[PDB]
Amino acid sequence: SKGEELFTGVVPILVELDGDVNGHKFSVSGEGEGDATYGKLTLKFICTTGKLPVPWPTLVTTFVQCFARYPDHMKQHDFFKSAMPEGYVQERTIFFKDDGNYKTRAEVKFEGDTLVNRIELKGIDFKEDGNILGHKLEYNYNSHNVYIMADKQKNGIKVNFKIRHNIEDGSVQLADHYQQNTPIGDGPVLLPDNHYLSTQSALSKDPNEKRDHMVLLEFVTAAGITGSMQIFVKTLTGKTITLEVEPSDTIENVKAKIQDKEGIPPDQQRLIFAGKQLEDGRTLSDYNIQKESTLHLVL
| CATH number of the CATH domain containing 278 | 3.10.20.90
Say if residue 73 is in the same domain as residue 107: yes
The contacts of residue 276 (CB under 8 Å, 6+ apart) are 287
The H or E element spanning position 80 is: helix 79-82
Nearest to 81 by CA among 92, 73, 70: 70
Rounded distance, CA 167 to CA 163, Å?
13
Say if residue 118 is in the same domain as residue 243: no
Say if residue 203 is in the same domain as residue 298: no
- Structural domain including 261 reads 227-299
Say if residue 133 is in the same domain as residue 242: no
- Report the side by side order of strands in the sheet with 270-273: 240-245, 229-234, 294-298, 270-273, 276-277
Rounded distance, CA 246 to CA 253, Å?
10
> Of how many residues is the chain composed?
299
Q: How many domains does the chain have?
A: 2
Q: Are 36 and 66 in contact (CB under 8 A)?
A: yes
Rounded distance, CA 150 to CA 152, Å?
6
Say if residue 216 is in the same domain as residue 233: no
Say if residue 217 is in the same domain as residue 241: no
Say if residue 51 is in the same domain as residue 115: yes
Nearest to 94 by CA among 4, 178, 1: 178
Phi then psi dihedrals of residue 59, to 5 deg: -105, -5
CATH code for the domain in which residue 123 is found? 2.40.155.10
Rounded distance, CA 77 to CA 121, Å?
28
Q: Are 214 and 61 in contact (CB under 8 A)?
A: no
85 prior amide bond cis, ω within 30: yes
Q: Are 60 and 217 in contact (CB under 8 A)?
A: no
**Resolution to one decimal, Å:** 1.4
Say if residue 210 is in the same domain as residue 279: no
The contacts of residue 237 (CB under 8 Å, 6+ apart) are none
Say if residue 214 is in the same domain as residue 242: no
Rounded distance, CA 184 to CA 66, Å?
14
Rounded distance, CA 67 to CA 36, Å?
4
The number of helix segments (H) and strand segments (E) in the chain equals 2, 16
Nearest to 47 by CA among 91, 92, 21, 16: 16
Q: Are 133 and 53 in contact (CB under 8 A)?
A: yes
- Residue 254, helix vs strand vs coil: helix
The contacts of residue 260 (CB under 8 Å, 6+ apart) are none
Say if residue 141 is in the same domain as residue 9: yes
